Design a protein around this ligand. Sequence first.
Ligand SMILES: Cc1cc2nc3c(=O)[nH]c(=O)nc-3n(C[C@H](O)[C@H](O)[C@H](O)COP(=O)(O)O)c2cc1C
Lengths: 318, 349
Amino acid sequence: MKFGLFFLNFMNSKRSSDQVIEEMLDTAHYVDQLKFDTLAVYENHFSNNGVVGAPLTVAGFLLGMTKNAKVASLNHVITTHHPVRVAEEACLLDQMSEGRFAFGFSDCEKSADMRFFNRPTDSQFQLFSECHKIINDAFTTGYCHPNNDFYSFPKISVNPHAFTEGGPAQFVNATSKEVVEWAAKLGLPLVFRWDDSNAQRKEYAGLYHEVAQAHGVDVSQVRHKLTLLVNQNVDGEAARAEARVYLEEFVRESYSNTDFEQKMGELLSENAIGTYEESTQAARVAIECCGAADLLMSFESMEDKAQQRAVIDVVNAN
Amino acid sequence: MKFGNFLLTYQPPELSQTEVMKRLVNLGKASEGCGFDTVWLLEHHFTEFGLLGNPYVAAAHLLGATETLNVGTAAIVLPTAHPVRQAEDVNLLDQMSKGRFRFGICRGLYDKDFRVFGTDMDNSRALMDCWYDLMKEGFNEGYIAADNEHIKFPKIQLNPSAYTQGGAPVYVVAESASTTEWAAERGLPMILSWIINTHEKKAQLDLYNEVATEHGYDVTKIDHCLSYITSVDHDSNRAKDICRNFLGHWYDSYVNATKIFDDSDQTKGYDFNKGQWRDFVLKRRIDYSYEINPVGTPEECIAIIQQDIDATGIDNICCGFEANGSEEEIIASMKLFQSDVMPYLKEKQ
Ligand SMILES: Cc1cc2nc3c(=O)[nH]c(=O)nc-3n(C[C@H](O)[C@H](O)[C@H](O)COP(=O)(O)O)c2cc1C
């Protein structure tokens, strides 16, 4: 198992967007001489629950300031975006860092964002596939040339060409059965998300394996990722209370159509939250359910910086 | 006196794309040591004229690797990207670098960009104008909403907030009277062309200052930049040869970029940018331009630039050194500019 960090960059009334960005940079600097292998950046727009809408731009900065960690987009939303911009940027990152960027991508999770950027929801999945097809053509050949209902323009060199043969390594956000199946057929690694239930992540893991088998795709060397939240305190009840408050707006924004208390309770028991004992046990369960080879952790719900570093150190040590 | 270093990311045919990208990285990192306060990055797509199509992301990288160095765009092609996505990028750069991002903007020179990204070059001026207002509204208020002829979207919270009050400082690449006036009405500094002469520079400024004064701006506190192709050499004629040969290649490369889709299928895909199109279409070689640029001995470089400073009152000098050959020869040209030209330029009396 490889282990890394991700940044949600949630803000609130006392913790400005200025403050959380500064936190992330300091955190990137702190863990760069440690054994964490990846720094991953969450994309969000138009709400407190993530102040980074351009994870590839943040990736550039992090790559400029660090020397050891790989740097990833966690869920760069391609469905709402021009795929030429994406491919250009991801290849630029590939090139400027000489291969330290990993391209995590996602379909759109808020229909509000689809409407905002004028992408039709009735055809969201085919749009997603066509976007990825253009990005992948550019990664693998240096060129693209779509002629479909979504994009049609003449053949172009997408500059700069990737530094890494085949482009930066890719992984896709496990956001629907449809996406999971698409990825399995392509032999693409998934990232499973911290905010999905263990059952959901297990269902996706199983679907993946089976679609892969059915189609003759060798997935034996595919390393899936899982993200989890980590908040560890010898006072385990304090860890849960702190994560509660941190997570509240999010649960109200992203799980509005589901029961608040039941979903909160689930996020708190299934994420790596609680005493060290409770925390690492939840991690073991979460990995066993989805079969992820790599674990990405966010420590950001621990507001006390010195406590946060102490848990990062303990985690680093084992 | 402030000094900038222009990076074109131009690909000469004997270099690979990988080698050109290593030079961007290296030349950005070398700049501070050579007495440059700012690195400016050009945007270009699809062709060897310049390989950097996303200066926000390349600026992130150089800003990430640095502490006190400023990095700017010269220039973002404003119309060809969504104004809210660009506002996010600017604020993020602004926040992460703690105020070291300089936001240079232009309408865009090449139709191929408008073609691929799916918007209308005949509308470039109105789009640049509208996108600017929306961005500046987001920088100022923390929110952006649109309900106009060009674009419409509901009000959104713009994340993160601007580090710099009113957003990162904006610069306008301007070389028509109409873009000069547009910049002046806003009090915004211009980056002046290196293909026009002192007399043309002074006339563009006099025009600017007229409009800027009517708005109440202090025309003496505006950070206008003189931009330059630069080749300093104790051997005057060798400097001129190097630059004359380069300007020929780059001009041919400019021409090639204008003709890239020359015989192609004009069919567009889905219109994600519906309000951006207009129904109607709208209604020069640079071979000798080294004569009006700091190309020659230090002394000759000093006189050309002092003549521009004296006619315009500009104290921000941005120089391009990439005509000069290998990475090593570019750095050496920067170093001779630093030692033998920088200390002798003076602000207008
Ligand atoms: C310093 C400098 C940088 C420029 N950068 C770009 C650029 O990145 N992309 C582009 O399409 N054109 C670029 N150009 C050209 C401008 O887009 C534009 O054609 C012209 O110089 C001034 O714009 P105007 O017609 O609004 O006056 C640049 C010109 C100069 C002098």
